[PDB]
């Protein structure tokens, strides 16, 4: 995929991983880069524009926990402006296992709903042009951090959902792949709520081990987008990009 | 695990798989069998009691989409009656990918919330005695039916969540394992809503291939409970019981 002159919507572009990905995206000379996020960040937007003034950068406030009809309304506004969208990147996430409902609503339901909404515009069965979805999941969707079991289970859900989208591309015209960071250091310093406080020190304990920077992650993220491989399960860990082979434990035969 | 004289709570005991499991459970001569389900079924309750009159069978109306505080209140009522509970079986599920929010609420959030609520009574850190949780997930949590991607993703979530619970048993005193049916024929005749109607004939197409009966499933379900293996990922497919080895793609190192 050559990102030059493409139109990209990125939900949650302005977070720790998001902003370093966005810096690399705008270097790739997009036509339009449309950032949807829960809170404004006007300085980040200006930083991005300064990297490549040719890119048209727009922002819309967006909370992925709104109903699907509300997402459709916002997407309509964007499609009526841009006419075409080439790639949707769904990057929203929280980690807080004291917030069970909200974890699931943001990390899983909200990603499914944004996806369902954009299919109104893209599905080839309704006369749409098809499209490409990149979902930020997590290595915890392969193997949990069991001390944050709700977070990890929410990410297993979207790893699954993304695999399924990719298998539906012959029907819908929409391809998809997952982007699964390992532990990635950003400008922020975190502490996490574990489920029922089984482990108050998850952030500290993770950082005892080798990790990667958000710059490394962001570089490999854009490399994965450029590879444009339907059904890939990309691991972005320890500064490398690696496609994972999903184990076949069971087959529906359909 | 010898189920004689044990106290078992079974959420969703009266469905297609549930009722055939329940028939085998009561043959195992439980002390108390407490059935929580969304709708009453007085004839089923009487059938069960007739299999083994020695078992004390009680019923409570329960919808897994209520808030965790409401689940705690009901569990308190049960613990104050029984004093001890040996095993919780979480079996609620729907399949309807036109109902995205409700699929996730029942299949994933609700199972997590019932689990979180019973940990108030069992967690060894609060002076509780520990316990055992059996979660009905699905083979689709290993490999999706991609035509029902929301259902399948909800089941990947609870396969993950259950693996994580099992790894927390040293902290909480609560062990856990997943029960993952393959395609299982019950007394009901179904048709399914696929996501965005990608495939209107999922039920018919599944049944083209080898399947198993709910009696076979129920027999292997009780066999898995009797094995009492923390962290097992049980596949109940084609009439057999098989533990699955989960692939290690990534390690947190914590
Ligand atoms: N930084 C990491 O190491 C990491 C990050 N993730 C995921 O990568 C994505 C970006 O994470 P981050 O940059 O590290 O975090 P950060 O908190 O900096 O960014 C969160 C982004 O999501 C946005 N957001 C949150 N809630 C909403 C909402 N309701 N509506 C719309 N937008 C919302 C928010 O505004 C921001 O753009 C999230 O999905 C993370 O869960 C995946 C893997 C790892 C995680 C790290 C934690 C332990 C386990 C891991 O595997
Ligand atoms: N029968 C199967 O072949 C099968 C069944 N499951 C799961 O096994 C469990 C039992 O399914 P079943 O007996 O086939 O279905 P059935 O519809 O007969 O039973 C559903 C049970 O969940 C209960 N329930 C539903 N909503 C609620 C709620 N809000 N609150 C409390 N209880 C509720 C309901 O009252 C009933 O006891 C569910 O979790 C299923 O998702 C797992 C695997 C397979 C599925 C079959 C469909 C395609 C993909 C497969 O892998
Ligand atoms: Ca270029
Ligand atoms: Ca016995």
Swiss-Prot record, chains A, B:
- Single GO MF annotation: alcohol dehydrogenase (NAD+) activity
Q: What is its EC number?
A: 1.1.1.1
Q: Whose protein is this, by species?
A: Drosophila lebanonensis
Kindly state which keywords UniProt assigns to this record, in alphabetical order. Acetylation, NAD, Oxidoreductase
Entry binding sites for substrate: 138
Q: How does it assemble?
A: Homodimer.
Q: Pfam families per the record?
A: adh_short
Summarize where NAD(+) binds, as residue positions: 10-33
Gene Ontology cellular-component terms for this entry are:
cytoplasm
SUPFAM superfamilies from the UniProt entry: NAD(P)-binding Rossmann-fold domains
Record-given protein name: Alcohol dehydrogenase
The protein's matches in InterPro entries, at most eight in alphabetical order, are given as: ADH_Drosophila-type, NAD(P)-bd_dom_sf, Sc_DH/Rdtase_CS, SDR_fam
């Amino acid at each position: 995929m050559d990102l030059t002159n493409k139109n990209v919507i990125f939900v949650a572009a302005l977070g720790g991983i998001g902003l370093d990905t966005s810096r690399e995206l705008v270097k790739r000379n997009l036509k339009n880069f449309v950032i949807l996020d829960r809170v404004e960040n006007p300085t980040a937007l200006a930083e991005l524009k300064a990297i490549n003034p040719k890119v048209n950068i727009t922002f819309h406030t967006y909370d992925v926990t709104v109903p699907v009809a509300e997402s459709k309304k916002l997407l309509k506004k964007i499609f009526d402006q841009l006419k075409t969208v080439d790639i949707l990147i769904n990057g929203a996430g929280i980690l807080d296992d004291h917030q069970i409902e909200r974890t699931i609503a943001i990390n899983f339901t909200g990603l499914v709903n944004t996806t369902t909404a954009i299919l109104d515009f893209w599905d080839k069965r309704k006369g749409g042009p098809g499209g490409i979805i990149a979902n930020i999941c997590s290595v915890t969707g392969f193997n949990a951090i069991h001390q944050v079991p709700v977070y990890s289970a929410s990410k297993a859900a979207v790893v699954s959902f993304t695999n399924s989208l990719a298998k539906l591309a012959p029907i819908t015209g929409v391809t998809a792949y997952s982007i699964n960071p390992g532990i990635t250091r950003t400008p922020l310093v975190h502490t996490f709520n574990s489920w029922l406080d089984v482990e108050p020190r998850v952030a500290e304990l993770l950082l005892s081990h080798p990790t990667q920077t958000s710059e490394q992650c962001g570089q490999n993220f854009v490399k994965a987008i450029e590879a444009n491989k339907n059904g890939a399960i990309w691991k972005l860990d320890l500064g490398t990009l690696e496609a994972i082979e999903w184990t076949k434990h069971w087959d529906s035969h359909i």
